[PDB]
Amino acid sequence: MEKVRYGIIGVGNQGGAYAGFLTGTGNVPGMPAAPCPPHCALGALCDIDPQKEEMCKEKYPDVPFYKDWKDMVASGDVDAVITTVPHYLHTEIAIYCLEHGMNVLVEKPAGVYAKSVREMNECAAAHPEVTFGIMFNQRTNKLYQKIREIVASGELGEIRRSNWIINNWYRPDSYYRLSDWRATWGGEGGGVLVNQAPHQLDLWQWICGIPTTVYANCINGSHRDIAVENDVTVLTEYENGATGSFITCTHDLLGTDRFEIDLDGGKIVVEDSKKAYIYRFKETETAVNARDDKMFEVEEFENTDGWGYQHTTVMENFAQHIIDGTPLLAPGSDGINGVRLANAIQLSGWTGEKVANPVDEDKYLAELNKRIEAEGKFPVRE
Amino acid sequence: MEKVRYGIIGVGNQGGAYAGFLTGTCPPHCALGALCDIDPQKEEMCKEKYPDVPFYKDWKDMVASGDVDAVITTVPHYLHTEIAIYCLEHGMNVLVEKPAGVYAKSVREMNECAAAHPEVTFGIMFNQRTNKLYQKIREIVASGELGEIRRSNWIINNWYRPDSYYRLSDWRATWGGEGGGVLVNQAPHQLDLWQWICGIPTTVYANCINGSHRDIAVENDVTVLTEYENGATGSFITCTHDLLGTDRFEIDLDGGKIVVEDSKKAYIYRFKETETAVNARDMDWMQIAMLTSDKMFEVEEFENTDGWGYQHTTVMENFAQHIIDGTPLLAPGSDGINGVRLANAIQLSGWTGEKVANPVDEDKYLAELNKRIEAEGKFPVREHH
């Protein structure tokens, strides 16, 4: 049980990268690549595009190739698959694999609409022997683990506020024109929220809990020739009375990336997703208020993860679950938290109203489908 | 006239400060004409500290006395428009304190009154407009040098105020006394500044928590989203329960970025090329990769701190100068309504849980305020029309 063979569905940008990581062919001069994880190997490659097949024949000549991912699953050349394909296919593949005893590592975001993701979760719960995971690779980052640990420990008391401005992923019209599926309601089901935002959206929920209510201002085609949102401002509320805000866009040439958490007993500020300043109050504010600088102590944490580290670490973690039951950092059921939040943001955005989180699945789907229909590029979803 | 005598209505903390500045216990064109307070203790203090300065219980008597050439409304906010309107109708120059008023209806009436008596000088104490820091940022934005604004965000949590502070004043933090908490107290100078530099929001969405970690009925934790005619967005966050509050004001523009830290220091980033230009170039991913990794932007730094009394005296002097020789006002009183409307819109959004257009319906706001006043039971309900 030394190694788990992985089949990549979609040898696109992400799929290609994964293939390189598994093969040890990942490194670019000027880019260290993480070595192949011990328990991981590349079993097979699947793509519907002939050009991709040609590339696969060239770069990976001795690696079995399949046009149809169902054929790859049945081949027994692979022990698990990774869904590096457009998001709409994620739950479709997952459900099929769970029903056919095939371990599935689903890419972010888990899916486009919460209904399909819920079905996937229920399917997995009904085939528990099958390993079911999501590629929330940022959970392998010691930075976010550090912040989660401190918050969850209750050492700094309860959260009162979170604020994350993350504007540093500039993407011009030229980038948007590169992919047909990306930035299309029918292709992606959204823009920034379904692409750049999901890892962060999961992280925010993972560290700060899941918002009870979502209010969002979503601008479609902000300084860009697309129909989907790429400038988003969100307000959230939480069971315990805390508030939150999240701001992101793809038109900022010099975007802030600053994540603040304010707590009863301290404060955390994370800059550029690398460095965290942790402030511990000598006394909780509640205590200070009751009474009627030397007052705080500051701790610093910095971590940067090298190319391939996060994805390989997930791959290895996932393999290990299959092999010896090691717990998953990213159990696939968790994928729905991020999808629900993205859906709630979009629906708030579309209706101009605050919404409870999660939103009604059918209401979201209708509004998505309406947009898909108008776009006319892709089939509506049932 | 060489000097304008000022009558202070409300020798409270602000009134006292002003009195000191003018006594030198002064700006060249400014003097203290008279003091007015309804509290006997204040009168006694005024007799002690300012024995040669005429004192009046009734501010209407002070106005008519001809001991003063202008008045300053250092009294609870509900009186601001009442005094202003009276003074405009009686040819008396009036410098209205922040916020201009509690509810927009009364402030609008004040503005219309002033517009009907234009010979009377009408001003507001937006003393932060005298701060070279905010002047610098306004100038750059308004010049169009950095192109249009796309986003503003101001987190300002550094005015920690515990329950003990709230207990100090009966009028403060009461719907009937103040008409709000953080929005009517700490927030107004900032709210004006935000509007002054970034324009006035078309729409306001707000999350306002009453009695956040505090034993008060009014809001003291506020998160706001705004939209603007030109498609920009904005956010404003403030509260009085943060022991170590951020104060960071960011403006993102087509052609640069501004970040102001702790209300003292500004970092100005000027893009070599505007984003619109970069987008038009349709640069390839390698070029995009080069962008994100300092060559693209240049940084300028600006820092100013204003010493005690500078801002208030400078306004006083500016105001006097308008009366004397027509010098333009840095803070024309009509502008006071921008901040009041925004505060009202924030509150009303907060109360209804819905986005609102700015400005909101005056009667709707007043009703919701009055409902809260009635429940509080500390003060009489306020009725206009």
Ligand SMILES: NC(=O)c1ccc[n+]([C@@H]2O[C@H](COP(=O)([O-])OP(=O)(O)OC[C@H]3O[C@@H](n4cnc5c(N)ncnc54)[C@H](O)[C@@H]3O)[C@@H](O)[C@H]2O)c1
């Ligand atoms: N975990 C992460 O950090 C991360 C990073 C990037 C992308 N991803 C995820 O990977 C997915 C997209 O990969 P990408 O962004 O490289 O897209 P891409 O367009 O570069 O690659 C997709 C490939 O899938 C192929 N394809 C589409 N439908 C197929 C099908 N039914 N069978 C086989 N091949 C099919 C296409 O031919 C294409 O070659 C998305 O879910 C994205 O969110 C995750």
Ligand SMILES: NC(=O)c1ccc[n+]([C@@H]2O[C@H](COP(=O)([O-])OP(=O)(O)OC[C@H]3O[C@@H](n4cnc5c(N)ncnc54)[C@H](O)[C@@H]3O)[C@@H](O)[C@H]2O)c1
């Ligand atoms: N511009 C600034 O920097 C700044 C700073 C603080 C306060 N202020 C403003 O000053 C005003 C008062 O605030 P404060 O902190 O001085 O409060 P305060 O309660 O200390 O002072 C108000 C004073 O007015 C008196 N008063 C009430 N009704 C009166 C009446 N009818 N006639 C005469 N006196 C009357 C009270 O007895 C008291 O002495 C408010 O509008 C506040 O917004 C402005």
